[PDB]
Model the fold of this input.
Amino acid sequence: GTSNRDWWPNQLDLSILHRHSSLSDPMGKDFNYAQAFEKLDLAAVKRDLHALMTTSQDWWPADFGHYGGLFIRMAWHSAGTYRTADGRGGAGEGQQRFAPLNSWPDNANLDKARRLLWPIKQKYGRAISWADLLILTGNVALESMGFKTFGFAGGRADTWEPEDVYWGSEKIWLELSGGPNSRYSGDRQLENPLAAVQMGLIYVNPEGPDGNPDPVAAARDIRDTFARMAMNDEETVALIAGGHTFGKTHGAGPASNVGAEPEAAGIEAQGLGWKSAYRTGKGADAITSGLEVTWTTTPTQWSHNFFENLFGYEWELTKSPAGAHQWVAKGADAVIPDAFDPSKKHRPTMLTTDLSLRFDPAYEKISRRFHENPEQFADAFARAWFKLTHRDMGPRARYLGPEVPAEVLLWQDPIPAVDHPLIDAADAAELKAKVLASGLTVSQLVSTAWAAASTFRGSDKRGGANGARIRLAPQKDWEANQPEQLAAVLETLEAIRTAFNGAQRGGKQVSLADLIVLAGCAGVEQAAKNAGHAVTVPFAPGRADASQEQTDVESMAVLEPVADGFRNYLKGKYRVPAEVLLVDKAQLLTLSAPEMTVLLGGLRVLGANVGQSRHGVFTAREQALTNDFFVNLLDMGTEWKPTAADADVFEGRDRATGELKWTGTRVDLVFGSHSQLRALAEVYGSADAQEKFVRDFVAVWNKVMNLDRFDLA
Amino acid sequence: GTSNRDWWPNQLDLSILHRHSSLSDPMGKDFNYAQAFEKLDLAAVKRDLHALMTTSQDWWPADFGHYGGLFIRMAWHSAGTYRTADGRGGAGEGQQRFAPLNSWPDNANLDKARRLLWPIKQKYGRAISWADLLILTGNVALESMGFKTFGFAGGRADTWEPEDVYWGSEKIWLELSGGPNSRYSGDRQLENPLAAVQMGLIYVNPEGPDGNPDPVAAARDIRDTFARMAMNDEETVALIAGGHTFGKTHGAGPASNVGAEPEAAGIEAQGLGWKSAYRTGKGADAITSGLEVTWTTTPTQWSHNFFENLFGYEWELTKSPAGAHQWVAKGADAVIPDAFDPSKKHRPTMLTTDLSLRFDPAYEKISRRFHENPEQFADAFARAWFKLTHRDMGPRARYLGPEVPAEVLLWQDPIPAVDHPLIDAADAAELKAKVLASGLTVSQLVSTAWAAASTFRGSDKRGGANGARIRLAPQKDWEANQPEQLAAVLETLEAIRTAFNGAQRGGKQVSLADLIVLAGCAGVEQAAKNAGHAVTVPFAPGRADASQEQTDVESMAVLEPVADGFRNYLKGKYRVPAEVLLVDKAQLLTLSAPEMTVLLGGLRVLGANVGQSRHGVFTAREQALTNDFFVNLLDMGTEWKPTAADADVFEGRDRATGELKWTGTRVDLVFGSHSQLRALAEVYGSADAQEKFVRDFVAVWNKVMNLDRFDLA
Ligand code: HEM
Ligand code: HEM
Ligand SMILES: [Cl-]
Ligand SMILES: [Cl-]
Ligand code: NA
Ligand code: NA
Done:
């Protein structure tokens, strides 16, 4: 069946803006997962998970009689798709159970792990999500094996279809670099937003870069990919050594024995894959990665044996039974237990990437410190495991249940508690009147609140207006935020705040975070008045101001917009057409196609463009809230052509006279070109639509202002 | 960006079940198009359209100063995608303005036609849909040129994204037959459900079959394609001759002058396409099909000059300026006017397909009759034009506005008016108790109501339980409906009806259509009671009973189910896997993936399978409404394998003992295989789900029972 995607493979794709439809969701529209979880007997779940650890099934027998290692890998893989570039991937939506991740080569036999959890999932139902269960099971496996976790939060709601994530352009699983769709260029530079070295891997190749077993060069890939998953050197070494304190790899025979991944298998496989023709196909005969390594002398118990072995032997390159590169300890005794036969023992072995922890000079110092001070190792691993598995959960207000750690961590972008009465409706009206009497314009008010609130992304629930981080490094210096203009707006708002607060009794005060948003609202109200309409913009107080010391400047840098079509901003020239980047931004903001359309049209006419560009400002009453953008964009009296200087800028000329009327970018004109977007523009550009446009704009504005308000949720 | 579709190109596609999401729709969730349309000043819209017909724009100058011909073609193309096999295509959703239809080669330059209508669309806004406007504009063009139309109904609500229709497998626009993706096999047999001879055409090739200019062979393709669009010989001749009474074709220069279709054009083209480098690129220089034919001496006025010319001359094969085959009248005077230069005149010309009307012997008799009696021609054309443009609108209750024809047509599957008081809630309870006391079983009641209601398709809004046509030819004899069993159920229900009706006062009575549905509701209530649950199934009376004389048996044939996964029924062996045919059926019934899942699971355990098959009946309490289907399907203690006799049947055996537990088809087992469907099955298979399962089943049952109840809209 030939599709639109076949005929027009480069056309913009809007279906990413309608994932999460209530059509695909089997739960009612009223279903609230937080409420269901808050009633779960989490202790009873943990008991059942503890019992499962040593209840082996014959269809996938447990190594050493304990599934703990398999479950820790399962949980680590669930979390470990996360990229800081866009916040996509991670454990927070339980995407491992959907395509493509359910069938990535690095997730081989994790299908079996998930199937082992079905009885517990079934027993507790909607009160524990898959997303939550995968992480909890990891935690319980650590606890069962003697490792004390830092804590656990529930609240990851299940999703019901695959997310549309760009995982790379390769058309071959695991393709080595330098191919026609290479994710690498120059001096081994991995393309943004990717955070893995080959298609279908979590981070790096365990044999070494493109299969070359050099631990020093592997270290480099490790450092790069883990950084792109938010982990520094200390966290990286704690995580790899911590994880590889447990379990084993599986490579008992050649990989050609292993069949179709889950999405390719026959219907009788009932959702599982990688069925193996090698001997029994499972347990002692299991093939997963092709490597055959067991790290420690007690694979089912926490120990300090990983670094004892790593440092205590010299290592020799060898091949697994499947042909994969790995390392064996020179002249060692057979001290490592077999997973199934008590009469067999094996020599200590390591992956190339394990040897990275010793042969990379910066890692070596941390590894040695961990070897000498195992308590520091244990604490760092517990902290990093918590971060890894919670990284995409958003503000602390979303964390549920009785095991949430009390300690506030820098990486959580923490927001101070509010400890004073909030402003009421009379106070809000007063503050808005002061904002308007100060001289701040519609365009300054709208631009500043947009800048503050539009850093939110729904992928990892970072960003937004709460915190007033727009006043701090690095947001106050971002080019998209117009630093000089921003400084002047914030100075006026700070004076308004200080005066209001000094005049109060009873300890009432307004935060700068709330005042930025409230001022934006006054600007939209003023804009509506300029167009002759009476409009009230909703506003919810309660934001607090975070400090500079609560704001990790390096972690904040990935939220910088390099493309924001809502302000007609592009920081440089890119591979990706500007309209593709607009739809990507709309997705992160959680907007539908109609919301994206109304929002952009209104922002153009309010003066939200960076640098006061005229591009797309298709109105003769700028700073008035009208549907002019749509009426003028759709006017057939105007003809459009790319400019000589720049093919991404267009001139719109009167068709009869030739006179220049407007200019726009690709972000502006795609609303007059794409057939679905132009259908949306037509609604808002019709003669009966002025009121609908205002209403719908105010709604989406308010939506964006509240994206991070999980304290109200 | 590599996608799931790239990695697993043959995996089932569920996204067809979630078009029409409220995410993509810009109108509020409360927007009711019928209400908006009913207040439109339709007379004022027709006046504006009338003025438009002679107001030429320089970007697309009007032939002969009159846009009427172009707008007729536009409206005919809007309707003429319709196929009777599935009811897909047609004008009823305004899909011509979306991909792919907006960019089909046969819709070349209809983008200009739609753009000419934007000012009127903009003026009237949401009170007239694009879908309605396209057809109305065709009508007004006919009227302005002296043709009396049969009427017009509004009510086609706009859609906001492309429908996913199978239009064929070719990867090249207009590919000639016999390629690697040939839509032809055998003795020129066109594959179901297609209704055109080449990808991107409306019906046939105007040069002749695969471009061979033989009018006799072309007649064959015409007859075949038109029949697949529900038009017999009489209607076909009326339509082609009627349309070709007006306007002209466009082929002033070689086709290689013409650029990118709209979906491939640059952004500056603002949604138009086919920009031409030939001379001015428009008007006198226009190129559309590459043919250059003007059929009549008054291309802007209704006449009987098409048949005068067809029969009054002999015809010679010739080539247009673009190289296309066409026909010119041997030795005729230049009597046909030029579209732009009053000083030029041309000879009469014809398409190969026009000559079909004369050289096919069956067409010739009709064409002669129409030539001799042009009043008969006019009436036939008006009736056919009404049918063509309304064929997918569904029951007469959906027809809006003041120009709806009063004559009831057999093709409308008409339903008699109700002229008596309806049963009330107490009556419905009494009738249900009588149905259950008669001895009819849960399985008979469910099966019979399913058979009656499930003929509905949302594509053209034909079918459903209204009318009680299940008791008539041909439905009563369809294999899926189990004719002997059906006859026995109907006999009992008719006696119940006769006794209830005879006992009433005051004219109150119950139709057999309503009693079939009500009995099915009693069966579902009894099934819930058998499982230990008291529920009431909603029921809305008001259906009526149509007669055999009001039922066109040949037109009803395309509604026969040859694949009904909901009854585990496949009438023969097909190309298409049975699970693909299930999702196709779900789409026609307007179900989401969750609705499809619940509905199938419930029907299995209620005994709805054809022939009392055990396949998928995964319960030991058949006729009780439980979630047993899902609990047993998902039980990992069972292992499944295809049988030796049949690869499409599977045995489910105890994993430990090998004992046979169940059998099922691909339709049953897909719910345990497909990653998104298994996630849905898990919800309904969980321990907390029995009440959700019953509630959701009752709701989808009721939805299916009411699919054709546009009387209650
Ligand atoms: C550079 C990073 C890493 C690489 C290249 C890597 C590679 C692998 C490979 C190839 C396996 C064998 C899969 C199999 O054949 O069954 C595996 C197993 C495992 N990894 Fe990692 N790993 C990495 C980091 C991690 C981290 C961060 C954790 C957890 C905190 C982790 C925990 C595990 C565990 C528990 C297993 C054993 C599974 C079992 O017993 O079935 N690894 N690792
Ligand atoms: C065998 C069936 C049909 C064939 C092959 C066919 C073919 C065509 C072709 C090739 C053109 C020229 C497109 C261009 O270059 O501008 C055209 C024009 C036209 N056709 Fe048809 N036609 C068919 C049936 C119909 C029917 C059923 C109607 C309406 C009842 C219709 C009405 C028209 C009109 C009005 C035009 C003139 C367009 C203008 O003036 O711009 N045709 N036809
Ligand atoms: Cl994601
Ligand atoms: Cl359709
Ligand atoms: Na994420
Ligand atoms: Na249709």
Remarks:
- The two ends of chain B are 44 Å apart (CA to CA).
- The first strand of chain B starts at residue 184 and ends at 185.
- Chain B has 24 helices and twelve strands.
- Residues 565-688 of chain B form a domain with the Peroxidase; domain 2 fold (CATH 1.10.420.10).
